[PDB]
Amino acid sequence: CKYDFATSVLFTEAELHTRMRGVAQRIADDYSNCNLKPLENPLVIVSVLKGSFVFTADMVRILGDFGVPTRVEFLRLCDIRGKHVLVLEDILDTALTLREVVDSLKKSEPASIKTLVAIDKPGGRKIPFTAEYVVADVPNVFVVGYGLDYDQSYREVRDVVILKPSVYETWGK
Amino acid sequence: ACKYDFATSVLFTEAELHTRMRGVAQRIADDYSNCNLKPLENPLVIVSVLKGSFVFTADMVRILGDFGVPTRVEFLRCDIRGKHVLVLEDILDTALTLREVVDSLKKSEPASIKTLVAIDKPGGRKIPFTAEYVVADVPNVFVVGYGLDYDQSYREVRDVVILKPSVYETWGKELERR
Ligand SMILES: Nc1nc2c(ncn2[C@@H]2C[C@@H](COCCP(=O)(O)O)N(C(=O)CCP(=O)(O)O)C2)c(=O)[nH]1
Ligand SMILES: Nc1nc2c(ncn2[C@@H]2C[C@@H](COCCP(=O)(O)O)N(C(=O)CCP(=O)(O)O)C2)c(=O)[nH]1
């Protein structure tokens, strides 16, 4: 590991962007008949969690690459009724946050609504929940990077790494 | 001959923005070299102001990390006493927002405080204000991209472009509903 605060690099910046391009192609095809256009009818991007800003910034730019115009909202509301909504989240774990955000947004009745997460932790669920688009899976380990923090730190790490246990063991004390 | 059907001209590409952000990142490293910036213990507190500033913030913190500047980010659209604060903003124009934030933040008595803007309109000031770091200047022209929006749209354009007048001449008359 090139990082002195990590035991392993799980996904590099290039790997994530490669995967996110595969997802952007699915989104473009998926919404091909939604008549998405700037101002008139963009895809409403609802970014959840403070750390999601890194992923949201890269995803929205990649989405524009594939002809998907967007409009970003942050909850870390606008006018979603009748409009297509895509919730983005950097990590999906217990799914308790996503379920609540999805259910509440439905109260506004948008044309459609789907979710996209950068890191899915399939093994952390406390309720059933599947995201329409997943960039990468991560086992049951504490990772930081790509916006994911440990106590507000390491968000800027370009890759998704396993935080060396000596880091958070010494920081709690 | 523009690559964007909605823009008259492209001012700064993503790559050019990053090349500039690399030069800025080196200066910040030198400037804070005596501050012992360290993750968790003493990170440089990044205050990102303005909704569209998430794009510049996402890229800037990452570049800064490349140059040995560990950061933690807050958003304005925490404890700062004794900490080093770098306010980040995608566009600086009248300076009214940045003046409010900086002077409101000085009340908490941080270790220091500076500002870094991606786009500085030197000629738009309503009050005097100079940013400590500026990635690039822009004149009296309406631009979009790199997080800068026109009515929430076009933030995702990877470059800072001048938006075609027909777009906002048309959309304004559409916003006129009543
Ligand atoms: N760095 C890092 N964090 C992890 C990891 N596993 C879980 N988490 C966090 C833990 C908690 C707080 O998250 C603040 C995010 P923030 O600071 O940006 O606000 N979470 C949620 O509550 C999401 C519920 P879900 O998404 O399932 O609905 C996700 C990991 O492995 N590494
Ligand atoms: N896209 C684009 N916007 C421009 C341009 N010139 C000015 N603005 C805006 C105008 C107003 C709205 O700001 C939206 C931020 P948001 O919608 O993301 O929240 N602003 C401020 O008040 C900054 C306070 P200052 O900089 O003086 O301290 C900046 C341009 O050329 N292109």
Short mmCIF file of C-alpha atoms and ligand atoms in Angstrom, two decimals:
data_model
loop_
_atom_site.label_atom_id
_atom_site.label_comp_id
_atom_site.label_asym_id
_atom_site.label_seq_id
_atom_site.Cartn_x
_atom_site.Cartn_y
_atom_site.Cartn_z
CA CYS A 1 0.00 0.00 0.00
CA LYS A 2 1.33 3.41 -1.04
CA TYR A 3 -0.54 4.99 1.90
CA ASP A 4 1.04 4.85 5.36
CA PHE A 5 -2.47 5.04 6.90
CA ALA A 6 -3.87 2.07 4.96
CA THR A 7 -3.33 -1.68 4.70
CA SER A 8 -4.86 -2.11 1.23
CA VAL A 9 -6.06 -0.13 -1.78
CA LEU A 10 -9.45 -1.57 -2.67
CA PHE A 11 -10.39 0.61 -5.65
CA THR A 12 -8.25 3.16 -7.44
CA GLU A 13 -9.53 6.45 -8.81
CA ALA A 14 -9.14 4.99 -12.31
CA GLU A 15 -11.05 1.82 -11.41
CA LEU A 16 -13.93 3.84 -9.94
CA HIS A 17 -14.10 6.13 -12.97
CA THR A 18 -14.00 3.11 -15.28
CA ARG A 19 -16.93 1.56 -13.40
CA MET A 20 -18.81 4.87 -13.25
CA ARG A 21 -18.58 5.05 -17.05
CA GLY A 22 -20.24 1.65 -17.34
CA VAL A 23 -23.03 2.98 -15.13
CA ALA A 24 -23.32 6.23 -17.08
CA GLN A 25 -23.90 4.19 -20.24
CA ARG A 26 -26.70 2.26 -18.54
CA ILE A 27 -28.27 5.50 -17.30
CA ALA A 28 -28.11 7.11 -20.74
CA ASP A 29 -29.77 4.09 -22.35
CA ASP A 30 -32.17 3.68 -19.42
CA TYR A 31 -33.43 7.28 -19.69
CA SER A 32 -33.04 7.41 -23.48
CA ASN A 33 -36.77 8.19 -23.91
CA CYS A 34 -37.19 10.56 -20.94
CA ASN A 35 -36.46 13.64 -23.10
CA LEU A 36 -33.79 14.93 -20.71
CA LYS A 37 -32.61 18.45 -21.56
CA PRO A 38 -30.97 21.29 -19.60
CA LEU A 39 -33.28 23.76 -17.88
CA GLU A 40 -36.33 22.28 -19.61
CA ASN A 41 -36.10 18.81 -18.06
CA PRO A 42 -32.79 17.80 -16.45
CA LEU A 43 -32.20 14.70 -14.38
CA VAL A 44 -32.60 15.79 -10.76
CA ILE A 45 -29.53 14.57 -8.86
CA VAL A 46 -30.18 14.37 -5.11
CA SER A 47 -26.83 13.97 -3.34
CA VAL A 48 -26.99 12.44 0.14
CA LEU A 49 -24.31 12.61 2.86
CA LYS A 50 -21.53 15.19 3.20
CA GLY A 51 -18.88 12.94 1.65
CA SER A 52 -20.98 12.24 -1.45
CA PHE A 53 -19.80 15.54 -2.96
CA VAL A 54 -16.67 13.97 -4.47
CA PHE A 55 -18.63 11.14 -6.10
CA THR A 56 -21.43 13.51 -7.14
CA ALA A 57 -18.94 15.89 -8.77
CA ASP A 58 -17.35 13.11 -10.84
CA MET A 59 -20.61 11.28 -11.57
CA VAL A 60 -22.48 14.37 -12.80
CA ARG A 61 -19.57 15.28 -15.08
CA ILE A 62 -19.39 11.71 -16.40
CA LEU A 63 -23.17 11.80 -16.85
CA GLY A 64 -22.83 14.96 -18.93
CA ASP A 65 -20.20 13.12 -20.96
CA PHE A 66 -22.85 10.55 -21.93
CA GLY A 67 -25.42 13.19 -22.85
CA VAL A 68 -27.25 13.15 -19.51
CA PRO A 69 -28.03 16.72 -18.35
CA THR A 70 -28.39 17.02 -14.59
CA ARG A 71 -29.36 19.38 -11.79
CA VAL A 72 -27.96 18.80 -8.31
CA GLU A 73 -29.61 19.04 -4.91
CA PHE A 74 -27.85 18.43 -1.60
CA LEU A 75 -29.15 17.03 1.68
CA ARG A 76 -26.11 16.46 3.86
CA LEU A 77 -35.84 20.93 -1.31
CA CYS A 78 -36.56 21.96 -4.90
CA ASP A 79 -39.41 20.85 -7.20
CA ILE A 80 -39.32 17.15 -8.09
CA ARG A 81 -43.03 16.47 -8.77
CA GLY A 82 -43.30 15.01 -12.27
CA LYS A 83 -39.52 15.08 -12.74
CA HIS A 84 -37.01 12.24 -12.94
CA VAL A 85 -34.96 11.80 -9.76
CA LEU A 86 -31.72 9.91 -9.13
CA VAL A 87 -30.47 9.77 -5.54
CA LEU A 88 -26.69 9.44 -5.24
CA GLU A 89 -24.80 8.24 -2.17
CA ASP A 90 -21.11 7.54 -1.70
CA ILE A 91 -21.70 4.58 0.64
CA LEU A 92 -24.68 2.25 1.03
CA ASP A 93 -24.56 0.20 4.23
CA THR A 94 -27.50 -0.23 6.61
CA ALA A 95 -29.69 1.33 3.87
CA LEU A 96 -31.58 3.17 6.62
CA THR A 97 -30.74 6.58 5.16
CA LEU A 98 -31.56 5.67 1.55
CA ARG A 99 -34.89 4.05 2.41
CA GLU A 100 -35.96 7.19 4.29
CA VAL A 101 -34.81 9.58 1.55
CA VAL A 102 -36.46 7.53 -1.21
CA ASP A 103 -39.74 7.13 0.67
CA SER A 104 -40.00 10.83 1.54
CA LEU A 105 -39.23 11.98 -2.00
CA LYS A 106 -41.99 9.71 -3.31
CA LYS A 107 -44.42 11.84 -1.30
CA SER A 108 -43.77 14.46 -4.01
CA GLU A 109 -44.62 12.01 -6.84
CA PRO A 110 -41.81 12.33 -9.39
CA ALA A 111 -41.99 10.84 -12.87
CA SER A 112 -39.50 8.20 -11.70
CA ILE A 113 -36.91 7.66 -9.00
CA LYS A 114 -33.80 5.49 -8.79
CA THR A 115 -30.68 5.37 -6.65
CA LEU A 116 -26.97 5.18 -7.45
CA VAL A 117 -24.27 4.53 -4.85
CA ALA A 118 -20.50 4.55 -5.29
CA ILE A 119 -19.69 2.01 -2.56
CA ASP A 120 -22.24 -0.66 -1.64
CA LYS A 121 -21.64 -2.65 1.54
CA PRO A 122 -23.99 -5.60 0.93
CA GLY A 123 -23.19 -7.02 4.37
CA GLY A 124 -24.26 -4.05 6.49
CA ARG A 125 -27.98 -3.98 5.71
CA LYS A 126 -30.40 -3.60 8.59
CA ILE A 127 -33.38 -3.65 6.18
CA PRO A 128 -33.68 -5.01 2.61
CA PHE A 129 -32.58 -2.50 -0.02
CA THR A 130 -31.11 -2.73 -3.53
CA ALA A 131 -29.76 0.23 -5.49
CA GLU A 132 -30.50 0.37 -9.22
CA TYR A 133 -26.86 1.21 -9.98
CA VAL A 134 -23.81 0.20 -7.93
CA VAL A 135 -20.29 1.27 -8.83
CA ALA A 136 -18.43 -1.16 -6.57
CA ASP A 137 -18.91 -3.61 -3.70
CA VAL A 138 -16.89 -3.53 -0.49
CA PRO A 139 -16.67 -6.27 2.16
CA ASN A 140 -17.22 -5.64 5.87
CA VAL A 141 -14.14 -3.49 6.42
CA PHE A 142 -13.72 0.17 7.33
CA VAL A 143 -12.68 2.01 4.16
CA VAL A 144 -11.86 5.67 3.63
CA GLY A 145 -11.30 7.73 0.51
CA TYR A 146 -13.28 9.08 -2.43
CA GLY A 147 -15.17 11.32 -0.02
CA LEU A 148 -15.52 8.67 2.70
CA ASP A 149 -14.05 9.99 5.94
CA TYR A 150 -12.84 8.84 9.31
CA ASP A 151 -13.93 11.65 11.66
CA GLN A 152 -14.00 14.22 8.85
CA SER A 153 -10.53 13.20 7.64
CA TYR A 154 -9.20 11.30 4.62
CA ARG A 155 -12.09 12.42 2.41
CA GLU A 156 -9.55 13.74 -0.10
CA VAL A 157 -7.83 10.36 -0.53
CA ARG A 158 -8.22 9.60 -4.23
CA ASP A 159 -8.77 5.86 -3.69
CA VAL A 160 -11.02 3.73 -1.49
CA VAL A 161 -8.61 2.19 1.03
CA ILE A 162 -8.78 0.12 4.22
CA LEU A 163 -7.93 2.47 7.09
CA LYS A 164 -4.99 1.00 9.04
CA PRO A 165 -6.44 -0.06 12.41
CA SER A 166 -3.66 1.77 14.28
CA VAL A 167 -5.18 5.02 12.98
CA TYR A 168 -8.61 4.85 14.61
CA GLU A 169 -7.39 2.81 17.59
CA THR A 170 -5.01 5.61 18.60
CA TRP A 171 -7.51 8.35 17.71
CA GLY A 172 -10.32 7.16 19.98
CA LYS A 173 -7.91 7.29 22.92
CA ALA B 1 -16.32 26.91 -33.78
CA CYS B 2 -17.35 25.69 -30.33
CA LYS B 3 -17.57 22.08 -29.16
CA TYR B 4 -20.61 23.08 -27.06
CA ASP B 5 -23.79 23.97 -28.93
CA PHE B 6 -24.90 26.08 -25.95
CA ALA B 7 -21.69 28.13 -25.57
CA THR B 8 -20.06 30.81 -27.70
CA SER B 9 -16.54 30.06 -26.47
CA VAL B 10 -14.59 27.89 -24.04
CA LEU B 11 -12.50 29.89 -21.59
CA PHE B 12 -10.66 27.26 -19.51
CA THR B 13 -10.64 23.50 -20.02
CA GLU B 14 -10.78 20.97 -17.20
CA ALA B 15 -7.09 20.24 -17.85
CA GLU B 16 -6.12 23.93 -17.81
CA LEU B 17 -8.13 24.41 -14.61
CA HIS B 18 -6.26 21.48 -13.07
CA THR B 19 -2.84 22.67 -14.27
CA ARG B 20 -3.57 26.00 -12.58
CA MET B 21 -4.93 24.24 -9.50
CA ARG B 22 -1.63 22.33 -9.37
CA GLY B 23 0.36 25.56 -9.28
CA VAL B 24 -1.94 26.93 -6.59
CA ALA B 25 -1.64 23.69 -4.61
CA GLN B 26 2.15 24.04 -4.55
CA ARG B 27 1.86 27.58 -3.16
CA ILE B 28 -0.53 26.46 -0.42
CA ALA B 29 1.87 23.68 0.58
CA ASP B 30 4.73 26.17 0.90
CA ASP B 31 2.53 28.71 2.68
CA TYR B 32 1.31 26.18 5.26
CA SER B 33 4.61 24.28 5.51
CA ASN B 34 5.16 25.74 8.99
CA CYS B 35 1.67 24.77 10.21
CA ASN B 36 2.21 21.00 10.65
CA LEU B 37 -0.99 20.09 8.83
CA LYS B 38 -1.92 16.52 9.79
CA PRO B 39 -5.03 14.37 9.29
CA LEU B 40 -7.30 14.25 12.34
CA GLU B 41 -4.95 16.26 14.56
CA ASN B 42 -4.57 19.46 12.54
CA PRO B 43 -6.20 19.34 9.09
CA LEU B 44 -6.67 22.45 7.00
CA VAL B 45 -10.37 23.22 7.45
CA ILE B 46 -11.92 23.72 4.00
CA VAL B 47 -15.02 25.94 4.02
CA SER B 48 -16.80 25.45 0.69
CA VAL B 49 -19.23 28.30 0.00
CA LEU B 50 -21.93 28.34 -2.70
CA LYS B 51 -23.89 25.34 -3.99
CA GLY B 52 -21.98 24.96 -7.25
CA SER B 53 -18.62 25.01 -5.44
CA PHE B 54 -18.74 21.24 -4.78
CA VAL B 55 -17.06 20.55 -8.14
CA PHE B 56 -14.08 22.82 -7.45
CA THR B 57 -13.95 21.59 -3.85
CA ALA B 58 -13.92 17.92 -4.86
CA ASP B 59 -11.04 18.55 -7.28
CA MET B 60 -9.16 20.99 -5.05
CA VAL B 61 -9.04 18.86 -1.89
CA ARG B 62 -7.80 15.96 -4.01
CA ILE B 63 -5.06 18.03 -5.67
CA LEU B 64 -4.13 19.48 -2.28
CA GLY B 65 -3.87 15.94 -0.94
CA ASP B 66 -1.41 15.19 -3.74
CA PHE B 67 0.83 17.99 -2.42
CA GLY B 68 0.72 16.90 1.22
CA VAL B 69 -2.15 19.13 2.35
CA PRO B 70 -4.64 17.07 4.40
CA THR B 71 -8.04 18.70 4.69
CA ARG B 72 -11.48 18.46 6.23
CA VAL B 73 -14.42 20.07 4.45
CA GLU B 74 -17.48 21.99 5.63
CA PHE B 75 -20.30 23.31 3.48
CA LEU B 76 -22.20 26.62 3.51
CA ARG B 77 -25.15 26.88 1.11
CA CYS B 78 -17.87 23.09 13.42
CA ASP B 79 -15.02 24.06 15.74
CA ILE B 80 -12.66 26.46 13.95
CA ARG B 81 -10.91 28.11 16.92
CA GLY B 82 -7.15 27.69 16.59
CA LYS B 83 -7.51 25.91 13.24
CA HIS B 84 -6.36 27.01 9.79
CA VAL B 85 -9.32 27.85 7.54
CA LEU B 86 -9.22 28.01 3.74
CA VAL B 87 -12.47 29.34 2.30
CA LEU B 88 -13.22 27.96 -1.17
CA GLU B 89 -15.60 29.46 -3.72
CA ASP B 90 -16.08 28.69 -7.41
CA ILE B 91 -16.77 32.31 -8.43
CA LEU B 92 -15.83 35.63 -6.80
CA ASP B 93 -17.61 38.70 -8.15
CA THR B 94 -19.30 41.39 -6.06
CA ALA B 95 -17.41 39.85 -3.09
CA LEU B 96 -20.48 40.28 -0.86
CA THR B 97 -20.77 36.59 0.00
CA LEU B 98 -17.05 36.10 0.66
CA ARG B 99 -16.87 39.23 2.82
CA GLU B 100 -19.76 38.06 5.00
CA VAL B 101 -18.35 34.55 5.43
CA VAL B 102 -14.75 35.58 6.12
CA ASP B 103 -15.69 38.22 8.71
CA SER B 104 -18.29 35.96 10.33
CA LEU B 105 -15.56 33.30 10.53
CA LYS B 106 -12.99 35.66 12.05
CA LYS B 107 -15.23 35.93 15.13
CA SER B 108 -14.42 32.29 15.96
CA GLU B 109 -10.73 33.31 16.04
CA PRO B 110 -9.16 30.64 13.80
CA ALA B 111 -5.41 30.13 13.63
CA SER B 112 -5.58 31.94 10.28
CA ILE B 113 -7.92 32.36 7.32
CA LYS B 114 -7.49 32.75 3.57
CA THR B 115 -9.62 32.27 0.48
CA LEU B 116 -9.29 30.37 -2.79
CA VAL B 117 -11.60 30.98 -5.75
CA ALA B 118 -11.68 29.16 -9.08
CA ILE B 119 -13.09 32.09 -11.09
CA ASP B 120 -12.37 35.66 -10.02
CA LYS B 121 -14.18 38.50 -11.75
CA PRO B 122 -11.80 41.30 -10.71
CA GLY B 123 -14.11 43.96 -12.14
CA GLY B 124 -17.37 42.91 -10.50
CA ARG B 125 -16.66 43.99 -6.93
CA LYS B 126 -19.27 45.91 -4.98
CA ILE B 127 -16.74 46.15 -2.12
CA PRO B 128 -12.95 45.80 -2.11
CA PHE B 129 -11.69 42.24 -1.72
CA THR B 130 -8.68 40.23 -2.90
CA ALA B 131 -8.52 36.45 -2.78
CA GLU B 132 -5.28 34.94 -1.50
CA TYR B 133 -5.39 32.35 -4.32
CA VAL B 134 -7.11 32.66 -7.70
CA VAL B 135 -7.07 29.87 -10.27
CA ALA B 136 -8.14 32.12 -13.14
CA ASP B 137 -9.70 35.51 -13.85
CA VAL B 138 -12.70 36.14 -16.08
CA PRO B 139 -13.98 39.49 -17.41
CA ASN B 140 -17.53 40.86 -17.67
CA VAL B 141 -18.96 37.70 -19.25
CA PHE B 142 -21.51 35.13 -18.12
CA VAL B 143 -19.87 31.70 -17.90
CA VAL B 144 -20.97 28.20 -16.90
CA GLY B 145 -19.25 24.92 -16.18
CA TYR B 146 -16.97 23.48 -13.51
CA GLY B 147 -19.90 23.87 -11.11
CA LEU B 148 -21.11 27.28 -12.28
CA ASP B 149 -24.77 27.05 -13.28
CA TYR B 150 -27.35 28.90 -15.31
CA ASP B 151 -30.59 28.38 -13.35
CA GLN B 152 -29.24 25.16 -11.80
CA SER B 153 -28.27 23.71 -15.21
CA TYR B 154 -24.87 23.26 -16.90
CA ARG B 155 -22.91 22.76 -13.67
CA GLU B 156 -21.68 19.45 -15.12
CA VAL B 157 -19.86 21.04 -18.08
CA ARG B 158 -16.22 20.09 -17.54
CA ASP B 159 -14.97 23.47 -18.82
CA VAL B 160 -15.72 27.09 -17.99
CA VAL B 161 -17.59 28.35 -21.06
CA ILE B 162 -19.41 31.51 -22.10
CA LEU B 163 -23.09 30.64 -22.42
CA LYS B 164 -24.79 31.54 -25.70
CA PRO B 165 -27.04 34.60 -25.24
CA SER B 166 -29.98 32.88 -26.95
CA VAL B 167 -30.09 30.36 -24.09
CA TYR B 168 -30.63 32.86 -21.27
CA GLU B 169 -32.54 35.33 -23.45
CA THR B 170 -34.97 32.47 -24.12
CA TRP B 171 -35.10 30.95 -20.63
CA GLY B 172 -35.74 34.30 -18.95
CA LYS B 173 -38.81 34.90 -21.10
CA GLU B 174 -39.90 31.38 -20.12
CA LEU B 175 -39.34 32.05 -16.42
CA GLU B 176 -41.74 34.96 -16.96
CA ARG B 177 -44.90 32.93 -16.37
CA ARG B 178 -47.69 34.65 -14.39
N1 LIG C 1 -15.56 6.16 5.95
C1 LIG C 1 -16.44 5.01 6.06
N2 LIG C 1 -17.82 5.21 6.52
C2 LIG C 1 -18.74 4.05 6.64
C3 LIG C 1 -18.32 2.78 6.34
N3 LIG C 1 -19.34 1.96 6.55
C4 LIG C 1 -20.39 2.69 6.97
N4 LIG C 1 -20.01 3.97 7.03
C5 LIG C 1 -20.83 5.20 7.45
C6 LIG C 1 -21.24 5.12 8.66
C7 LIG C 1 -22.59 6.08 8.70
C8 LIG C 1 -22.21 7.54 8.80
O1 LIG C 1 -21.85 8.05 7.55
C9 LIG C 1 -21.51 9.41 7.58
C10 LIG C 1 -21.26 9.87 6.14
P1 LIG C 1 -20.98 11.70 6.09
O2 LIG C 1 -19.91 12.05 7.10
O3 LIG C 1 -20.52 12.10 4.71
O4 LIG C 1 -22.25 12.44 6.42
N5 LIG C 1 -23.24 5.81 7.57
C11 LIG C 1 -24.67 5.92 7.34
O5 LIG C 1 -25.40 6.29 8.20
C12 LIG C 1 -25.24 5.55 5.97
C13 LIG C 1 -26.49 4.69 6.17
P2 LIG C 1 -27.01 4.01 4.51
O6 LIG C 1 -26.17 4.64 3.42
O7 LIG C 1 -26.81 2.51 4.49
O8 LIG C 1 -28.47 4.31 4.31
C14 LIG C 1 -22.17 5.34 6.58
C15 LIG C 1 -16.88 2.57 5.86
O9 LIG C 1 -16.51 1.47 5.60
N6 LIG C 1 -15.98 3.68 5.74
N1 LIG C 2 -22.73 30.50 -13.54
C1 LIG C 2 -22.27 31.87 -13.38
N2 LIG C 2 -22.65 32.60 -12.18
C2 LIG C 2 -22.20 34.01 -11.99
C3 LIG C 2 -21.43 34.63 -12.94
N3 LIG C 2 -21.18 35.87 -12.50
C4 LIG C 2 -21.79 36.02 -11.31
N4 LIG C 2 -22.41 34.87 -11.01
C5 LIG C 2 -23.24 34.51 -9.77
C6 LIG C 2 -24.12 35.38 -9.48
C7 LIG C 2 -24.43 35.08 -7.88
C8 LIG C 2 -25.19 33.78 -7.72
O1 LIG C 2 -24.36 32.78 -7.21
C9 LIG C 2 -24.85 31.50 -7.50
C10 LIG C 2 -23.98 30.44 -6.83
P1 LIG C 2 -25.02 28.93 -6.53
O2 LIG C 2 -26.28 29.02 -7.36
O3 LIG C 2 -24.24 27.69 -6.91
O4 LIG C 2 -25.42 28.83 -5.07
N5 LIG C 2 -23.22 34.99 -7.34
C11 LIG C 2 -22.80 35.36 -6.00
O5 LIG C 2 -23.59 35.78 -5.21
C12 LIG C 2 -21.34 35.17 -5.61
C13 LIG C 2 -21.01 36.07 -4.41
P2 LIG C 2 -19.31 36.81 -4.63
O6 LIG C 2 -18.57 36.01 -5.68
O7 LIG C 2 -19.40 38.25 -5.06
O8 LIG C 2 -18.58 36.78 -3.32
C14 LIG C 2 -22.33 34.44 -8.45
C15 LIG C 2 -21.03 33.87 -14.21
O9 LIG C 2 -20.36 34.39 -15.03
N6 LIG C 2 -21.46 32.51 -14.39
#
